Amino acid sequence: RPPVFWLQGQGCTGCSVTLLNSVHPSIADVLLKVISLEFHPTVMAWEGEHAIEHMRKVAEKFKGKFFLVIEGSVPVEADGKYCIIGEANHHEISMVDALKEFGPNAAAVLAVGTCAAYGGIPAAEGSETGATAVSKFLGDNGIKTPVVNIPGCPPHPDWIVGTVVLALDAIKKNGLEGGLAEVVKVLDSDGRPTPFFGRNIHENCPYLDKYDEGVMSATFTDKVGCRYDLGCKGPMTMADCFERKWNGGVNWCVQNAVCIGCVEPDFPDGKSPFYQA
Amino acid sequence: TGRTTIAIDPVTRIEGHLKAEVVVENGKVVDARLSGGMYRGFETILRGRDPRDASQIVQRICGVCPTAHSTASVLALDEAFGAKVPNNGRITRNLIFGANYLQSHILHFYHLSAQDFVQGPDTAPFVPRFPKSDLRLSKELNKAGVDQYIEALEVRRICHEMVALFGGRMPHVQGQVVGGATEIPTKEKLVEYAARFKKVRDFVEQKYVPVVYTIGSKYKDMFKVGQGFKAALCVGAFPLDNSGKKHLFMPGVYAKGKDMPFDPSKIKEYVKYSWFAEETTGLNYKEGKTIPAPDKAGAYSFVKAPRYDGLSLEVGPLARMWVNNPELSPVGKKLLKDLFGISAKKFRDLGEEAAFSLMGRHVARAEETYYMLGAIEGWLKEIKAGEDTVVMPAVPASAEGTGFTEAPRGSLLHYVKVKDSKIDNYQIVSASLWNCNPRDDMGQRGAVEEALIGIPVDDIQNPVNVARLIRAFDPXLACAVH
Ligand code: SF4
Ligand code: SF4
Ligand code: FCO
Ligand SMILES: [Fe+2]
Ligand code: NI
Numbered sequence: 142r143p144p145v146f147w148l149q150g151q152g153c154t155g156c157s158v159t160l161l162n163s164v165h166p167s168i169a170d171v172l173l174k175v176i177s178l179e180f181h182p183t184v185m186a187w188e189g190e191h192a193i194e195h196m197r198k199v200a201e202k203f204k205g206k207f208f209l210v211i212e213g214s215v216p217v218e219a220d221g222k223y224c225i226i227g228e229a230n231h232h233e234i235s236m237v238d239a240l241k242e243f244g245p246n247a248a249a250v251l252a253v254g255t256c257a258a259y260g261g262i263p264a265a266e267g268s269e270t271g272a273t274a275v276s277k278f279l280g281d282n283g284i285k286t287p288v289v290n291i292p293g294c295p296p297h298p299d300w301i302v303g304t305v306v307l308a309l310d311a312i313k314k315n316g317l318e319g320g321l322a323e324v325v326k327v328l329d330s331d332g333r334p335t336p337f338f339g340r341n342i343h344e345n346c347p348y349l350d351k352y353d354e355g356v357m358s359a360t361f362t363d364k365v366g367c368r369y370d371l372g373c374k375g376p377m378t379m380a381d382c383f384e385r386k387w388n389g390g391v392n393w394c395v396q397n398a399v400c401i402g403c404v405e406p407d408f409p410d411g412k413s414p415f416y417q418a
Numbered sequence: 419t420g421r422t423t424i425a426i427d428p429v430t431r432i433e434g435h436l437k438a439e440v441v442v443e444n445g446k447v448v449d450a451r452l453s454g455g456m457y458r459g460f461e462t463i464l465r466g467r468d469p470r471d472a473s474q475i476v477q478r479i480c481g482v483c484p485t486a487h488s489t490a491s492v493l494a495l496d497e498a499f500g501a502k503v504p505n506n507g508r509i510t511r512n513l514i515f516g517a518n519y520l521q522s523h524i525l526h527f528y529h530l531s532a533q534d535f536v537q538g539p540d541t542a543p544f545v546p547r548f549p550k551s552d553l554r555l556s557k558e559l560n561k562a563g564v565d566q567y568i569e570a571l572e573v574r575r576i577c578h579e580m581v582a583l584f585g586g587r588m589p590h591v592q593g594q595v596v597g598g599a600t601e602i603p604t605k606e607k608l609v610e611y612a613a614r615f616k617k618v619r620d621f622v623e624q625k626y627v628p629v630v631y632t633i634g635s636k637y638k639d640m641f642k643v644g645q646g647f648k649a650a651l652c653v654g655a656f657p658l659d660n661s662g663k664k665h666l667f668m669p670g671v672y673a674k675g676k677d678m679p680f681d682p683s684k685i686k687e688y689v690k691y692s693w694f695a696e697e698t699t700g701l702n703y704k705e706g707k708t709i710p711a712p713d714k715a716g717a718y719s720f721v722k723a724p725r726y727d728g729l730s731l732e733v734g735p736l737a738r739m740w741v742n743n744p745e746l747s748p749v750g751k752k753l754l755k756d757l758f759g760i761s762a763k764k765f766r767d768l769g770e771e772a773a774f775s776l777m778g779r780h781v782a783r784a785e786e787t788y789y790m791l792g793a794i795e796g797w798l799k800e801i802k803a804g805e806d807t808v809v810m811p812a813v814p815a816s817a818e819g820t821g822f823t824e825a826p827r828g829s830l831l832h833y834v835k836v837k838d839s840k841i842d843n844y845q846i847v848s849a850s851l852w853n854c855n856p857r858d859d860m861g862q863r864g865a866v867e868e869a870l871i872g873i874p875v876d877d878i879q880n881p882v883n884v885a886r887l888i889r890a891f892d893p894x895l896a897c898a899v900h
């Protein structure tokens with residue numbers, strides 16, 4: 142089971158919580174059978190500098206072979222002080238510092254959630270922390286490690302687990318270098334795996350006939366008409382929610398309300414106002 | 419033994435980024451400082467937006483308690499917009515939000531706190547840990563703890579299915595908006611909610627509440643520490659009618675042995691020890707300002723310091739159960755007698771010392787989970803399948819509104835001011851803000867800082883009780899800072 146470190150920047154822990162909702166494999170099976178989650182601040186047993194030093198000990202031994210998950214954006218303003226993630230030997234560790242430390246040595250970096258993938262809400266208009274997407278931060282700092290974006294606010298658990306499994310299966314078919322190249326091949330131009338993000342919501346929406354006919358709901362609770370006039374961003378959104386749905390298949394955003402385009406690189410500002418077209 | 423400073427960063431098995439620094443002298447904590455180390459600035463991000471967007475944006479404060487923020491936001495918007503939420507939409511909202519209380523408490527006890535007392539399997543992320551972790555449970559009770567941790571992973575996921583039935587998805591519901599709830603409950607989906615609820619209820623009554631008392635009975639010393647100020651706040655939550663006057667949790671303040679009403683005008687947020695501009699200190703939320711100052715000398719946290727009439731108060735399940743003083747659960751009363759020799763009927767029969775303690779906060783959270791079962795059962799009987807749940811109000815040109823509720827971790831309020839049909843100001847005063855804040859402008863510690871005083875550290879190389887105390891308050895630093 143390959144070692145995984147899960148670092149949280151400017152995240153809300155929603156990307157961790159969504160993962161806990163994985164149905165098959167369950168999160169228990171993910172943690173005991175699929176990955177070795179060596180560092181994760183929300184769930185791990187140890188704490189503080191001991192947890193940081195444990196991650197550093199694993200990283201030293203498994204240099205080039207561990208997977209680094211980033212949840213949340215990386216704020217660069219004020220010398221990184223808007224996100225301090227730990228302290229070891231009286232030296233504070235910012236998210237900037239941590240990504241520069243571990244990023245170069247990971248097999249691959251999985252930018253989980255729209256914040257990590259694209260900046261998201263912490264980077265949106267009115268912010269002032271210099272919130273930066275993982276791939277941009279790494280590129281700006283000359284770090285060439287492969288990045289895979291798994292966006293959504295939050296992502297569906299199946300997108301996170303499925304991307305992990307796709308990468309691990311690819312590595313066991315073609316080795317580390319070969320397998321990472323196979324993964325690159327199934328990424329779209331926004332770095333997203335096409336199994337989950339290759340199809341447009343609207344083109345696959347059950348209300349498409351109503352859109353084409355001009356039949357629009359005027360209240361949220363009218364479930365017959367298309368949701369476009371209520372603000373649905375499905376026409377601009379690439380995700381498979383229409384099929385997989387959410388939380389054990391019990392609902393999804395378009396059925397319940399509207400799609401807000403949460404997986405898209407312009408979320409939230411280019412998807413807002415949410416409740417008009 | 420002498421004097422030792424211990425810094426813990428990150429404090430793990432909480433939500434968010436927290437550093438705790440304590441001074442230990444002669445085996446006990448004698449000073450403490452808590453530092454919320456991550457800032458996003460939702461209060462400035464929200465400015466200039468369509469006010470209806472707030473009930474989506476604000477949920478991203480926190481993916482553990484997004485329904486609490488959604489609720490406070492839509493209540494503020496309802497007031498600002500003049501929207502009259504239909505009765506059935508009020509009940510639907512309560513079903514969406516109540517299901518996440520169950521999720522959050524179960525997550526907290528098992529997946530965040532239980533490893534403080536239970537040794538997990540011999541694999542990451544359950545090892546490595548402190549060599550002397552003070553894990554006292556028998557082989558059989560420890561195995562029960564692990565089995566329940568594993569089962570709880572399924573139970574908390576089912577709670578999120580409950581949230582999503584009428585909320586759309588979780589984390590980050592789509593189903594609450596200004597004016598009500600976006601999806602009318604159908605007969606068929608109410609069957610689905612109730613079937614899941616039955617499974618959750620059975621786990622809460624048969625496993626969770628018993629295990630908290632049973633583990634507690636092996637850590638009876640943990641009822642004798644962590645009192646802090648012994649002062650509590652509740653702002654009220656879960657409207658039970660459409661008049662705004664009866665709630666499942668009723669508001670109140672408790673301090674220095676006295677009960678008093680809650681008056682929100684008495685809230686001020688201080689920033690002397692927080693990374694915000696000095697000129698913004700001491701403001702009530704209706705005039706709140708958020709101007710980061712990450713280089714300000716002497717400050718140590720991105721959490722502001724809220725005070726109620728100058729008082730440093732705590733929030734959360736203990737606060738609500740203390741203020742409201744309901745009857746204890748039948749199983750709790752039985753186990754208090756069987757395992758502790760304690761005769762108790764009402765919550766306050768625990769006594770102030772044992773209630774305001776490390777283990778008392780875990781007990782309070784389990785008892786509150788039980789209490790929520792009856793509320794949700796009531797709402798499932800009260801809801802009418804098929805009855806409309808939303809109105810569609812226009813955006814007002816100029817308005818203000820405040821939403822008050824109780825998030826799983828304690829009191830939450832959102833204040834919005836609308837000008838020219840856009841957000842002019844938006845201020846959040848959240849639960850872990852009340853608990854995990856730094857000193858105020860007078861030098862008075864925050865609630866958890868004060869509760870750390872006296873915590874035993876008999877082994878400075880294995881100072882496990884520092885974070886055990888912190889975890890009892892279920893901190894969420896994403897919420898505290900926003
Ligand atoms: S509801 Fe949304 S995704 Fe579906 S047809 Fe209408 S605009 Fe397209
Ligand atoms: S339906 Fe739209 S808003 Fe909902 S999860 Fe999918 S992409 Fe995100
Ligand atoms: N519960 C929760 Fe979140 C916190 N602290 C809020 O408000
Ligand atoms: Fe605030
Ligand atoms: Ni929270």
Ligand SMILES: [S]
Pocket residue numbers: 433480482483827893894897
């Ligand atoms: S939270």
Ligand SMILES: [S]
Pocket residue numbers: 482483484485486487518519522825826
């Ligand atoms: S919540």
